[PDB]
A paper describes a structure:
Hemoglobins (Hbs) from all jawed vertebrates form similar hetero-tetramers, with two *α* and two *β* subunits. The MWC model explains the cooperative binding of oxygen by low affinity of the T state, which is stabilized by intersubunit bonds that oppose oxygen binding, so that the less contrained R state shows higher ligand affinity and is preferred at higher oxygen saturation.
CO-bound adult human Hb (CO-HbA) shows a mixture of conformations, with the R2 conformation most populated, R strongly represented, and other intermediate states present in sufficient quantity to produce maps. Models of human HbA in both R and R2 conformations are described from the same data-set. The maps for classes 1 and 2 were obtained from 148,562 and 123,614 particles respectively, giving resolution of 2.26 Å and 2.45 Å ([Fig fig1] and [Fig figS1]). The analysis here shows that liganded human HbA in buffered saline solution exists in a variety of conformations, with R2 being the most prevalent. The R and R2 conformations of Hb are characterized by different positions of the penultimate *α*_1_ subunit residue with respect to the *β*_2_ subunit ([Fig fig4] and [Table tblS3]). In the R2 form, the *α*_1_ C-terminal residue Arg *α*141 and Gln *β*_2_39 of HbA move apart so that Arg *α*141 does not form any interactions with the *β* subunit, and the side-chain forms a salt bridge with Asp *α*85 ([Fig fig4]). The interaction between Asp *α*94 and Asn *β*102 side-chains is preserved in both human HbA and HbAM, in the R and R2 conformations ([Fig fig3]).
Numbering used by the authors:
A (entry chain A), B (entry chain A): 1 to 141
C (entry chain B), D (entry chain B): 2 to 143
The structure:
Amino acid sequence: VLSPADKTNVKAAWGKVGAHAGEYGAEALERMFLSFPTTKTYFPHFDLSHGSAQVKGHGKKVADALTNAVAHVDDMPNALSALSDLHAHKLRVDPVNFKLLSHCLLVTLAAHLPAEFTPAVHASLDKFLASVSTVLTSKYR
Amino acid sequence: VLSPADKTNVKAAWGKVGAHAGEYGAEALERMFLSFPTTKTYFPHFDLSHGSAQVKGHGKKVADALTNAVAHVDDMPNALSALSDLHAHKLRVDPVNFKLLSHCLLVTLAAHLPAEFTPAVHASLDKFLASVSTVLTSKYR
Amino acid sequence: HLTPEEKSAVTALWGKVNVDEVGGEALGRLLVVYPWTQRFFESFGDLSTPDAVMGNPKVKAHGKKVLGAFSDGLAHLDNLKGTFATLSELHCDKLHVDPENFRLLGNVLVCVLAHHFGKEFTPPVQAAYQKVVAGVANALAH
Amino acid sequence: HLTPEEKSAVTALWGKVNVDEVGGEALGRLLVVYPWTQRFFESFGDLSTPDAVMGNPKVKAHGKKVLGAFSDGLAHLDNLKGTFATLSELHCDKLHVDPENFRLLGNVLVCVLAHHFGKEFTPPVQAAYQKVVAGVANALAH
Ligand code: HEM
Ligand code: HEM
Ligand code: HEM
Ligand code: HEM
C-alpha cells in the first residue's frame, strides 16, 4: 500500500524521467539480461545482443506501461488488466523475475538521475514497482 | 489482487470456520511457535507454553481481525489501518514472519475443515492471507 | 536436525501415506496455488482449470516420482545433500527452477498431509515435517 | 564465478570508493527502504525519519564496519564461505537475521555504487558486482 507521500514522490521522480523513459527501459532490460541470464528464457525469439533494436523497442513499451501505471496509481488493477492477462495467464512469468527487473530499473535511475534518487524516493519507487509487480503476476480477471 | 471468485471462495470458507475461529487462531499460533521458534522473539513477555491462556486470547484476536478483513475484503487498507500501525510502525515485524503464520493457518484449516479445503479454496485463501500480510507490513499512514 | 523422537514421529506417519495419491495431490495443488509453476509442465496437457490439473494423468504419474524422492530423503535423513545431488542438477542446469519454488512445494506437501491426517497431524508432528521439507529444499538448491 | 576481466572491473572501481561514506549510505538506505530492519538497530538512537537515519552517527560508524567486510571478501573472492564464517554465526545465533535481508543489503549497495559512479557503473560492471554481492549473501547464510 502506497502512502500519500509515496504517491507524490513517484509522480515527481518519474516526471523527471520524461522523454528519456524508453531509453531507461532499454538500459534496465539490458542490465537484467546481463546480470541475470535466466531471464533470457522468456524472450527466445528476440535478438538480445547489445544495442539490439528489439530490446530498444521493448524498453520503450515497458516505460510507457510504467507511465500509465503512475498516472493511474490509485486504480492500478483496472489500468493494467491487459498486461496482467499477458504476464500471469499467457507467459506465466515467475514473480522472482519481477524483483530482478525492479532492481535493474532502480539501478538505471540511480545512475542517471542521482539528485532525484534520494533515500525517500528510493523507498517510494521500490514500493511502487512491487505494487506494479503484484498486479502483473495476479489473475484477478 | 483477488479475483471475484477468490472473494466468494474466502467468504464461504471462513464462514464455515464460524465460532471455531478463535480456537483455530490459537492452534495456528501454537504451530508457528513450535515449527518456527524464531517467531517467539516478538512475544518476550508471553507465556508460550502449551495450553497457555495468553496464546488462546491472542488467537481469538487474530481470528477476529481476519473476520473483519473478510467482511471488508474490497477495502482492506482502510479496515486494517490500526493493525498496520502496530505491525509495521511499532513492532517492525519482518515480512518473512507473515508467510510463516499464513502457512500455519492453512495447515490448521486443512486439518479441521478438509471438505472445504479444496485446491480452489486453498488458492483463494493463500491469496487473501498474502493480501492481509501486505497491508500489515506497509506504512501508508 | 531431528531428535530421535522427531525421527520416529515422521516415520510412523509416512507408513500410513498412500504413495499413489499424495504426490499427485501435492503437485496438483502447487500448479493451482502458484499458477506460474505450470510453465515447467507445458508438455503435460490441459492445466487450465483446478479440476483439469487434479485429474491430469501425467500430473499424478509425476507426483508419484516426486514423493518417491521425499521417501528416499526420509531414509537418508542424515545425508540429504548427497541423496539429491543428481536431482539438484536437473532442476538447475537443465530446467532452471528458482529455489523459492522448492520451499513452496514442501509447504504444499505439509498441507496435503494435514488434509489427510487431521488430528493426527499434531503441532509436534508438523514441526518435525517442517524440518524434513526444509532439508530437501536446501539439498535441491544448487 | 568471476572471469579474470570481471575480477579486474570490480577491483578498479573499489579503488575509487570512499570507504568512510559508502557503507553508511548503504546501511542508511536499507533502514529507510526496508523499515523492519530497524528493529535490529534499536540501540542506535533516532531512526524516525529518512534524514534522522541518514545523519545518525552510529549508522555511519556501523556502515564502515560493513563495508570493511565487503572489502575483505573482495580480497578473498575464491574463499568467501571461510572469510564470513565467524560473521554468519553472529547474524544467526546471536541476532537471527532472516537471510533474505542479506540479499536486500547487497542490492542496496549495488544501487549506492550506481548513484556514485553514474556512467562508469556500466551493465558489465553491474553484472560482476551482482556476482560479488550474491557470494557474500550466500556465505552469511548459516
Ligand atoms: C515492471 C514490470 C514489467 C512491465 C511494466 C512490463 C511490461 C510489458 C509490456 C508493456 C509488454 C508488451 C505488451 C505488448 O506488446 O502487448 C510486455 C511483454 C513481455 N514481457 Fe513484460 N513487463 C514487466 C516485467 C517482465 C518480466 C519480469 C519479464 C520476464 C522476465 C517479462 C517478459 C515479457 C515478455 C516475454 C513479453 C512478451 C514479449 C514478446 O514476445 O513480444 N516482463 N511486458
Ligand atoms: C494474519 C496476520 C496477522 C494478524 C491478522 C494479526 C493480528 C494481530 C492482532 C489483532 C493483534 C492485537 C491487537 C491489539 O490487541 O491491539 C496483534 C498483535 C501482535 N502481533 Fe499480530 N497479526 C498477524 C501476524 C503477526 C505476526 C507474523 C507476528 C510476529 C511473528 C505478530 C506479532 C504480534 C505481536 C507481537 C503483537 C502484540 C502482542 C502483545 O504484546 O500484546 N503478528 N496481531
Ligand atoms: C521440492 C521437491 C522436489 C522434488 C523432490 C522433485 C523431484 C523430482 C523428480 C524425482 C523428478 C524426476 C526426475 C527424473 O525423472 O529423472 C523431477 C523432475 C522435474 N521437476 Fe521436480 N522436484 C521438486 C520440485 C520441483 C519444482 C518446484 C519444480 C517446478 C516448479 C519442479 C519441476 C520439475 C520438472 C519440470 C521436472 C521434469 C519433469 C518432466 O520432464 O516431465 N520440481 N523432480
Ligand atoms: C549482507 C552483508 C552484511 C555484512 C557484510 C554485515 C557485516 C557486519 C559486520 C562486520 C558486523 C559487525 C560485527 C562485529 O562488530 O563484530 C555486523 C554486525 C551486525 N549486523 Fe551485519 N552485515 C550484513 C548484513 C546485515 C543485515 C541484513 C542485518 C539486519 C537486517 C544486519 C544486522 C547486524 C547487527 C544487528 C549487527 C550487530 C551490530 C551492533 O551490535 O550494533 N547485518 N554486520
